[model samples]
Target: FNILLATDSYKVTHYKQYPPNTSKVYSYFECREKVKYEETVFYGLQYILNKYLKGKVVTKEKIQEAKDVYKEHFQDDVFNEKGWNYILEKYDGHLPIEIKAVPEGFVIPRGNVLFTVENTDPECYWLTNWIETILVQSWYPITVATNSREQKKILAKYLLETSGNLDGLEYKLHDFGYRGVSSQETAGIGASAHLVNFKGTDTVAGLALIKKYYGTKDPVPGYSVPAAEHSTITAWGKDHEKDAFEHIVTQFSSVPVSVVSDSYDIYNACEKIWGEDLRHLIVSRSTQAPLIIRPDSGNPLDTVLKVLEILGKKFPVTENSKGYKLLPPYLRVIQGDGVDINTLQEIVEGMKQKMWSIENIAFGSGGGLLQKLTRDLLNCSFKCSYVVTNGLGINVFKDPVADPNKRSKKGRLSLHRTPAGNFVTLEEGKGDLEEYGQDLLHTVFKNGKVTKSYSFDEIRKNAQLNIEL
Candidate 1:
């Protein structure tokens, strides 16, 4: 899909949404007055970063430069004098914050609390609480990236059996559910998930974000098609069946035909028509012009078994084609209706049980990778412990609730891995850097500036390496 670039003339500024906690009582105010609250908090973040840590590190320099660019046209007093003090009054000069989380794209299981953030100063915990919205924003990208890898592993096995074209396996895993998601950010992160699995993405907006921040590019080299090929759902309902299969064959005779075979009867449809008509075409068509059939409505395992029985009976019988007596094998079957890792394993197990050759299966998936997996698994919450009362910093811990699910640790802490290999939480004084060896969330950002920029391509490579272990 074509990604329209943001033109140079386009202004990159903060979107004027409401303050994270706008009360209804404030509705009596004008639109400009309403927007002031949003702008105040936005610019307050900049002032705190710049005034506190200007040259602490090279990273801070970049941040200060960005702030300078913004200040060129905007007023600093609007935020620092009126806005910051006004917001500080609401929370008594404290800002709620995001506890440092684990690295942004890391895969964490259910029940793991990744990170916690609280007031840098004890009295400021109320101020830091508002930062939850931005902190939890990373949830979906990390979740999608984690699950997409699992989906890819399952799909790789199925594609290897089908005519041995691993490239096609990489090519056909399209993402198509942005409109169904709850938010635009969900769609963007969902596309990131598919991209993490070495699959191509169709969401141009999401793709651009990953490309900018993550440096991801197309998996296939020099691949481009007309805009018409953007949404290929029209090609559905063709297969080793009667009228539908014939319609596909007659129209896209020169190209690879991606046929959906589960509209009427999945296994039975392939038994009758795939062997009789499509087998001959398989022999005559070019290797580039292969056939793909999607079984979208039944049990993937049972359907593959039924389809393979027909394929084996009609194809050329040898080591590669497995010695069919009647006709040559032409089309490859792909399972999609309900494909997941467990489902793929079942298909493999069924193939073994029936003694059927799994030499013609590819995969195109939706829903399962995008929706079946629950989103709530991504949780990273931390609380504030200290607030600055006078010139000195004081510890002000949050009460640990009786419910273990909602309980949080008190004071500044560090995540430590014991010598025995289990992860341990140690208070700052209890464990030194040398005692635990190292910290994972090591200053990626300092003083409101990104210390380093990781491109999407590099992030993907990092994801690949991390998944291997």
Candidate 2:
């Protein structure tokens, strides 16, 4: 998870270089104009990681610690210090400025200036041109978070209609793509982004972010593990039905269990063995904990319906099985045979039409959410635009394209669903904006200092709420 640190060399010459800030004498965590340098490194490292390591897992503690260690080690290096100072000096006394983008995860269209960074001093605008790559990288997680939130919202609606419940669907949107990403940072931040909208995830780095930023609960000991929980293990195979069933139940009696039962026989196992002996054992031994049956092969919809039908028949809803004494509350299905937005949509629609309860079909969205949702499908991109020049700043705008399909707007933009309620517009300029106009990008950094701390919980809440729309 080492980030190969690079920057525009030409910008290095303009600054008045000082010795690296190696003295541990200062109580402050920052060196002289340290945040500006840090923010650039943070943004650049994260961006490259996101682009290359979209599904890799990372350690938040390790990555941040590494970042700080690296920064500390090079704190007073003449060459490095000279480079940072160059960008600052080019802007004269003012710093290259950009917005913190509070409420950053809004659905922004293509061709829009998501945020801007400009030379705070007008004459020094030239020094900030190289700032785009790093700055734009910071927005990807937000962008992905924003897009993922929307997708989750869409999925949530489908899930609710299918199951008449939303509680279980949250964690169903887990990030199983940690290994698919290019770097640890990408896995960490991308997982953080997804966490903002979805519930929990399997990405180790993502879980760390949840704890660091969102006040998430630590893994429940004896159930959830720091490295790999029992939830990570599974069993499947027709010949190994007895072994598979016993293995999952034995390994995770107190926690949720998942068994891939479609390996050898689907309908027969569900209708006979699983429905009779295994179901009773799970019920008697596991109490109310869920037992997720993963149908790894077959026409998933048909197999899922058949399994549920068998369960329903075996555990019929008599008065004794109703209300507080329900013995089947924990039985559910996980359609791992190949699921995607389309397949999920079909399953939901079919369940709705058939009036069957497919709500218990938790999705392990691996290949679909990871591989199918290509970087292009996600529209994950990085772009840079000048925000301010010298000491003065002005609101900038670009009209939404006339083609409508290519109607990505630029400058400071805000999104609101249209009055018509079917389409959303990225209008040019401010539509009755306040004193500062439509300044979506604001001075997040000033004089090379950070003005505020951004909390992960706040961002997560915002993502969840916005995704509902």
Give one digit per residue, the lDDT tens place, for model 2 in 345-412: 67766655655544555665554554344333434343221143233333332234654432233443
Query: Where does the lowest 10-residue lDDT sum fall in candidate 2?
Result: 26-35
User: Which candidate ranks first by lDDT, i.e. highest?
Assistant: 2
Error of 1 at 410 (Å): 3.4
Instruction: Assess each prediction's global lDDT (C-alpha) against the native.
Output: 0.45, 0.47
My TM-score estimates for the predictions, one after another, are 0.63, 0.64
Q: Can you write out model 1's per-residue Cα lDDT over 1-120, one digit (the tens) per residue?
A: 000111111222211232333221000000011001111000011112222322322232333443454465464411122333333445443232233434444432333334544433
C-alpha RMSD values across all candidates: 12.1, 10.8
Kindly provide the TM-score of model 2 when superposed on the true structure, using C-alpha atoms. Answer: 0.64
Total backbone clashes of model 2?
A: 27
lDDT of 1 at 44: 14
Q: Poorest 10 consecutive residues of model 1 by lDDT? A: 26-35
Runs in model 1 deviating more than 4 A are 1-101, 107-125, 153-176, 201-205, 217-255, 317-330, 340-345, 355-359, 378-382, 385-402, 415-425, 428-433, 446-448, 465-469
